[PDB]
Structure formats: C-alpha cells, structure tokens
Symmetry: D2
Subunit: 331 residues, 4 copies
C-alpha cells in the first residue's frame, strides 16, 4: 500500500486503435491514463494509484523535448515523500531509449519502471493488463530500490542499460545479452543479477542541471557495404556535434570513408563514436580502427540509439574524447 | 574426391595481421589462398583443391563492383563440369551480404559455401582451420545441392537468406531466427530444415543478365528517436533510386518525416522500403504505415543491409512497387 | 470456411482452476470444448467449428493408453472428406510428446495442430484465446498440408519433431533449435523452413497397425555425477524392453555403470538408447561410448521424452539395433 | 604477476585421445597438468604458474568422493597467502556440478575458475588453449574477487550457480538464463552483472566442516508421460535420504505417483524436491503440487543435477523441509 504513480506517455496499451483480433494494428494516441487504470482495476489491490498524463505521443516520434519533459516530470514526482514508486506507460518502439535516458539523468533510489504492450488494448490475448498490474507490484515493491531504471515486459524485470527490442510481433520482443535482473510472477519479484554500472544516484548527469529543451546534435549513420559519405556531410553541414557510426561488425569503417570521416572530425570538429549494427558483444576500442590515432570513441556495448543518447548527454559536460570514452565504459 | 575450388576474397583467416594471442586484432589484407590451403593441408584429404585469389579486400569495404565481380567469377567457375563445389573465404563483417547476393543472382544447383574466421589466423584457438576444412567437406559433399547458398561457421550450415552477424567477439557470431539448415561434424553434414524461398536456379535475377559494374543507388537511413530528414535529402539529391528506412520497431516512421519522406517519393520518385533495426520477426505491410496509401514496400524479414541488396537488384527489373513488394515476400 | 475440428484433451485453457490474476495456478480438469469454443467466438469467423471432448486429462499424467486413444480418434477424424483440419487443445507440459507421437503414427496430409496456454483461462492477459483462434486459422488454412504435425504457441508454427518446453512461467515457453516452420500473424500463416524428416504419410509407423492399449516398456534413467544402477535394475526387473539413458553431455555413461548397463543389455536383453540432458546439439553415435562394440543406439537429437516414444514405437516393428538406429537418424 | 595455481582434474584439454581433425572423439585420461602448461606457454606471461594434478578422471564419472577431495584441495590451496587465484581444468560434462559445489562449500574471496574444452587437445581449431590462457588472466586478475566461483568458456565469464551445458558439439556449449557475469577478451575482464545469491564467504556450508568421503544419498528421478514408481521405490529401498523429481513442466507429478511419492516421504521419511526437465524459468512453490500440504520442496531454478547437490549438502545440516526450502531460495 505504497503510492505508485502511473505516468502515461501514450503507446499501444494506453491507446488501442483498431484490432479486436491481433497484434499488427499498433495504433495509439487513444486511451489516457484513467481509461487504463479503470480497465485493470486489480492494480488498485496492489497500491494507492494516481495517473498522470505526461504526453500522449506514439513512441517512434519522441524527440529530445519529450525526453527532457518526461525526465523532469519523473524527477519532480520522484522527489516527493509520498511517491514511493513510479510506473511509465510507453510505446514499445523507443521504450529502450526513455529508460536509458532516465537511468542516466534521474537522481533517485525509488523504482522507475517502464511498462508497455505488444498488442493493441483490444487484440485477443492482450499483454498490457498483466504487464500494467505486474509493473505496479514492483513499483510498489519495498525491495525495488537501487536497481536503476527497469523495464517490465513478459513478467521479466529488465535493467534499462541493455534492454532492447529484439523481436517484432511477439509478446516477448524485449531481450538483453546480459539478461534480466529477474522475473515478477504472481505479484512477487524474484532477483538473480544486479548491474555493475552507474545509474541514478551515482551518475554524472542530471535533468536538474540540464536546462535547454534540446541536447547537442548527435545523429546516427548506418553501416553496410557500398556506403557514401553523404549523410555524414549532410549532418556536419547541419551542425551536429557528433556522429554515431553504426559500423558493420566490430565498429567498422569502410576505407573509402576513413579519409572523409577523419576530416569531418579534424576540420569541422565532429565527434566520432564507433558503434555497431551487431546487437551483442561490444566494440573494443583500438581494435578495428585506431581511435587513439584518430581521436575517436569505442561505444562499448550500447546499440546506436543508446550510444546516441550518451553522447548527447556527454557533450553537455565535455568535448574531451577520453573522458567520454570513459563514460561509455561505465554506464 | 570432388573438385572444390577455394575462392579467396581476403578476410581474417586468409589474412592475419597482429595477434598470436586473441581475437580483437582483426587485420586482414594478409594471407592469399595458397598460404591458406597450405596451412590446413587436411583439406586435401577431403577433395581435389584449387585456390583462386578473386579479390584481396577487407570485408567491410566491399562495394557493388566487388560484388558483381565475385558473382561473375563464381558464376564462371560454377558452370564447369569439373567444379563440383565452391568455397568462399570471406571477412565476417559483410559475409551475410555476399551470400545473399550470390543466393540471388547465381543460377546453379552446386554447393556455394562462404566460410570465415572470427580470430586472426594467429590467435590462440583460431577458428579458421576447422571452418575451412569443414567448409570443404560440404562443398565436396554429394548431398549439398539445391540448398541455395550456405554459410558455414562454428560447425553450423546456414542458409544465406537469413544468416547474420549477431555477436561480436565470439567464435559463434553467426545466428539466424529460422535457424541453421543443419550442422557439419567430423566431415559429415547433418540436415534438419530446408528454406522455403527462391534462390539460385529459381530466381528472377542473374549476373549473366546484369552488365554494369554497379547497381542502381539504394541506401540505408537508420531509425531512432530525434531524427532529421537530412540523410534522405542528401541521398535523393545524390540520385539514389530508393531509401531503405531502418525503422524503429515494426518499420516505423516518425510523423515529423512522413511529410518529408512522402514528397521524396511522390515528387523526386524515390522508392521507400520500410525495414527495421529489430533483428527478428518481420515488418508486416500496411501495419505501422499504410504502404498502399503511400506507395511504399514492407521489407518483410530482411535486415537493412540485405533489403538494400534486394532493392538494388529489384530496380534492375521493375519500378513497380507491388511487383517488388512481391520479391520481398519470396526470397 | 473449412471444417476444423477442435479436439479437447483438457489442459489449462480448456480448463482454468484458480487465478483471475496470473500464471502459476495451472489447474485444469475444468472447461470442456464447448465452454471454450463459446469463449473465443471469433474462431467461428475462421471456419466451421465442431468440438470433440477426446479426454479431460491434465497433461503431465497422460499415459500410452491416452496417447493411443487420442491418436485413433485423430486418425478417424482425419480420414473424413469433411474434416479439413484438426486442432488439439493440450496441456503444455507433455504437448511436445503427443505431437511427436501423432507426427509419427497418423497417416495424413491435413493440418494437425496442438495448441495450448501458459496461463489459466482466467489470469490477466491470458494467452489461450489468441492461440485457439490462431491455431484455427492454420488448421483451416489451405496451405497447411504436409508440414507434418505442428504446434502453435505465441504466434509461432512449430514442427512437432523438435518443439519442446524450454521456459517455465512465460507465454513463450516453446522453443526449438532448428527453429519454427514459421509464424501466424493476424489470421495469416508465414513460412520460412520445412522439416527434412519423415512424418505422417511417409512413416513406417501407423495407429491403424497398432492394436494394444499400451506399447512395449521403454523408460528413462537421468544422468548426473554420483549415480547408482538401481533404476536400471528396477526397470529390467520390471520388464521394460529398453532404457533411455539421459546421459550427461554427449550421451555419457559413467564407467561405474557401463559394466552394469552392458549386462542388462547382454544378459537380460535390454535395449540401450544413449540420449542427453543437454537440450541442443545431438548425440553422435560411436562418440562417447562405442555403440557398435556394445550394441547400443545414438538417439541423435531427440530429448529423453521423445526418444522414449520412438523406441516404444520402434520395438513394435524390430529388435534390431541398427534398423532402429536408422529411425533415430530419420524422424 | 600473481600466482595462479592450475589444478588438473582430467577432461578433454588436459587429455586428448584421438582426433587431429574434430570434436567428437572426446577421450580424456590423457595429458597431465604440465603437459598442458607446457603447451600453452603464453600462460606464463600472465602469471606465476604452478600445476597440481588433483585427479585424472573423465568428467561424467566423478562421484562425491572426487568432489569432496577436489573441494578440500581447492580449500587448502586457497588459504595460502601465495595462492592469488586458482584455475581448474575440468571435463565439460559435469563442470557445472563441480563449480556449484565449490561455489557452495569453499570459504574464500579469491577467484576460482573452472575452465574446459569442447574439442580434444588435437582437433583442428581446438578451444582449450585460448580458454586456459584466458582462464588464467582472470584468476590472476586483481578484480576477480567475490564473484563467487566462475566458469570461463568461449571468452565468457559465467557464475557457477546457473552455468550449464546447453549445446553439444559446439565450442559454445555453456549458456545461462540470467546470463554471464561478463566477457574476457585479449587478457582483460569486462563486467556487467553480479549474482544476488549466497556463495563462498557467505554460505552456510563448508568442506572444512564436512568430514565423510560421501554426502547423504540424494538421487534423481526423470519426468515424462507413462512413468512408473519403480526408481523411487528402488532408491528408497537403497536408503537415499531425498529424491529430486525431474518433473515435466513446472515440477509436475503424475497423479498416478503422488499417492506413491507421498508414502515414500510420509512413511519411509524420504525428502521430495520438485525440480524440472525444463532448463529455464523456475519451479514456483505451491504451484503445480501443494508442497505445504505434502511437506515437499520447490527447487526454484536449479537444474536436477544442481538441485541434487544442494539437497545432499542441505541434509548435512537439517531435515527440516522449510529451512531447506529456504536454501533453494538463496543460492
């Protein structure tokens, strides 16, 4: 009987716009926070519920403004003696992204859970309910503190730092290579692992310290064979501070672009983070390109999207390639 | 005692340039085809060996010219009564890419195996040898015909259509969601599944019919939250025929770009293939954007790189969005 | 508008006995076939439905009598010009077992689908419905013929030969190492692979030819370190025809038992199938024990339960260790 | 330049007995500890090496005597100011078993690594070397303390509590559902997770306190459909203290045996641990059988082999079903 606040951002559960049959019609915009709370009324047996409608966006279309604004609201909410835990309803597409961000800039020990649904609130066998309820049992859990930010999908408790969308039609679309912190079954949380990274109270970054309504321009260029320097060139010329190179294999750069990408960093001062298109394992620094020689960064095990966010947050504090390289090794 | 031809393209095995200790120093350019054949001399007990040095590139840097040129050589080689099977030594990064391509344009029933190594020929416990030898036992196998093109890594026989680099430091970096056709252990192949797709002899495409030294411009734009229309715009303006949209989730387009991406297709005639950044499951047509309304294509279960190649090959035969949509459903 | 027959065997969906909240209370016995058909009424838009209550057992407690009796009913049903496809409601625990069996002894080309549920019909976000409906869309599918027997769980279409329960609380408990034949999303089936094994019309075995109400005694002994010959000895002495040795690793027998297990085969004529406790990869004949020397069988890639059934069916036709070894290589 | 002691127990690496070609011929007994140390001489650049030949067994055949004897040696070795870390060469089959045991009874903070090989020291591309060397870099690592016991296979650092043999021919046969603590690449360890369980210094159990040359009889009965009470009955009658029931699904007992298994516990005082044959997820207490009613134990997420060892160690301290149930929830 802790007060969990459910913070609605939109997404397929707190919005279903088609199918009373199956998955595919992921069309949100639709069911605000109470419409939800009132649909899974069991959630009330778990705790004292209060629903805030923070945004009513569709996941894929979130920008830094929405991130900085949900972060601030979840920061304001989390500072109150009466908020015990917080649950966020989020579209599955970019969930990974918001939990990395809050993981990063929110200084709190209380449970911050992003919960979602792979089926419209109206498809047969809809996943949302059992996830909202279960998401709730943890946010109200007395032993959910200092886990960092967590995702809760298919009874799994995931650490924000590595949870990502690995599958596309299935209710069990959320995976991790280091795995889940644990499982939540029939109201109760079960723990197995703990992150060895920096999050929440032990994190350089802070939305309280961040004041814009945007972060410095960081943008992603995807690797494949037969590439062109056109996106790099378009992005430099647009005034982005760094490019995350979604390198093939281990952070790989095509020998026709090193020339090009080197100047974009040397001349126009672009930062260069070497990540991959390969979901598991990590990009070893100095391995497949000499970062040291070139002044680049090895984004370790962050997927492009996530690396994107660390760098945007990184360049709020330094321009120094080694100190940033240092954060990619810690988070 | 079949004649397998080993066709060297470069890559870490048929080239090791650093470490007598471990993985990380993936530096090719180094050990041509005989240097190789003479290092795993057991390969000769398997068949009659002949090594061709087709290129001496590093995987990540292959272009369409190298693709069209290896394709033609593997086509010329495969038409001879004396070539029973062919083995290709390839860098692991873009292997997936060459096997999709040949899978596609080579009209033959004989075994075409791309083999590679995750450790420099000189690291302790180097994977290359057992893979070259094993790759050989299949290409010389009498029951390796009409499997399509196959990859052979960590004793696994993979179908070219879905095999990709899922892990980064490990010898078992090659995965598939539909799985392996089978396993090769101690010289012998073991079968379990067969593709239900079109490949080799039953394939619209053909390098014999393709004459350039390049295919039509197709290029990849990667999805994440806070995106810009700059790469699309850079690529249209450069004269690419289609963009593969590495959409977040199920092929997702940010509502700030549909406006933009629509005109780039409507006005400047760009083709638009909606794929994902999510490795497994597939992008359902009409689901998360109305392709029908917009004239776009659902790239089904092809990862961006691979979708990239189908489209380049697609626009050699049609400009018709439905007939192409039709190939994404078949290959 | 094909006539699919839903054949109810019991299990958690066609029986929920506790929880209106979550998973754990798997207590069947409860909801017969119509109670079901009338709960997922959408199933009727898919086809002409007819529900048969074949048994009302709990999965784990099925015996050979229940197997032979469901087999015969599914054989009688499948011979009729008006039965287009059949769907079986089954407890998840031993589903794998019934689909292997029918896979084996039912001579038909029509779709035989075993469908189940990991949550009681009453838990929040219950999986049953979307699975019954979806199971139905395939059994009524015009392109579901000669796939063998299939399992349909979490929108996945699985081949009976290798599908097994790999996870325990989750809706996505059914895995395979060779993977799924395909996926069923929003009424439609999507194909990727096909088995390369013998099933249904191309299968030695037949319930029509089998007349008892039991098969010959075949029983499983589990491997671990510090074992005793007591179960073998108990089973020989009880009059079982063969023992499936759930060997550690690659079919491994402890050197303190080879002496013992050899005599139980040499003297009392016991058959010995060397399988494993390791779920993936397979037990190579002559590898870790000399079968040839000893007169044993390498059960290839069948898990103990499944090997158990092949052997019971094997000893209905031969006692010849090589001809049986031959079936383990084919099914 | 720490002193790691390599403790040889036998197994395929520190013993290869056939193949200069591939995997399958796993025949140990063969290459003692120095024969090894002298074959991967790079290991000496990592630290000061000293090889002890503790046993020269083949993995699958280890008993409690070998366990209690390796435990004591690794306990004696670990108490010395000059032993910084210890590496154990072990057969892959039952490795999981020894690391669980030592994990349990060894009171130390120093790195205890069990290392192995899936290919004979003589197969092409043999895994042993890169694993022995790498195993060494951690045992000599200054930041390998209080991780518990670890397995090191395919550059992965695994926690003893959950690491098991999931695949059979491949070099990457060792998996975990909660994942790896981290990876070791090119001499350096990389951390991501930490166990949340009790091990080494914070563990009830102790080989120093254990004096026999055997532990109380605990033995495993495997679940499938069509079972018999003969093994239970054979084991009770032999004088085992508890049976680990390798239940189908979630710890499931066939209704024809509950009668039987109940008396074997009620009458002859047998302990009953309900585990599964399902490798992932865990057996929830009171779920699929009422333990409370019956006086049984839910072995949570321990596979049969491992549950086997906890119970043997459990019954050295209590006979009390709740206090033991309590250890299954902690280790």
């Amino acid at each position: 009987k802790n007060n969990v606040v459910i913070v609605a951002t939109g997404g397929t559960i707190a919005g279903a716009g088609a199918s009373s049959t199956n998955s595919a019609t992921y069309s949100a915009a639709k069911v605000p926070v109470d419409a939800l709370i009132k649909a899974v009324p069991q959630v009330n047996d778990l705790a004292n519920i209060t629903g805030i409608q923070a945004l009513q966006v569709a996941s894929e279309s979130i920008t830094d403004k929405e991130l900085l604004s949900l972060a601030r609201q979840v920061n304001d909410l989390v500072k109150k003696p009466s908020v015990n835990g917080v649950v966020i309803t989020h579209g599955t597409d970019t969930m990974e992204e918001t939990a990395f961000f809050l993981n990063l800039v929110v200084h709190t020990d209380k449970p911050i859970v992003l919960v979602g649904s792979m089926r419209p609130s109206t498809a047969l066998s809809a996943d949302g309910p059992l996830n909202l309820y279960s998401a709730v049992a943890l946010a109200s859990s007395n032993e959910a503190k200092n886990k960092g930010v967590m995702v809760l999908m298919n009874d799994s408790i995931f650490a924000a730092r590595d949870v990502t969308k690995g599958i596309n039609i299935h209710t069990h679309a959320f995976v991790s290579q280091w795995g889940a912190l644990g499982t939540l079954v029939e109201g109760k949380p079960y723990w197995f692992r703990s992150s060895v990274k920096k999050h929440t109270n032990n994190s350089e970054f802070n939305i309280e310290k961040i004041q814009g309504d945007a972060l410095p321009g960081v943008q992603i260029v995807y690797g494949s064979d037969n590439m062109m320097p056109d996106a790099y060139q378009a992005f430099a010329k647009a005034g982005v501070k760094a490019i995350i190179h979604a390198g093939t294999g281990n952070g790989s750069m095509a020998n026709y672009l090193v020339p090009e990408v080197r100047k974009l960093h040397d001349e126009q001062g672009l930062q260069i983070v070497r990540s991959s298109r390969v979901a598991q394992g990590f990009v070893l620094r100095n391995a497949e390109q000499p970062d040291d020689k070139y002044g680049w960064i090895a984004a370790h095990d962050l997927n492009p999207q996530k690396a994107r966010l660390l760098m945007a947050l990184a360049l709020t504090k330094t321009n120094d390639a080694k100190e940033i390289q240092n954060m990619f090794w810690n988070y």
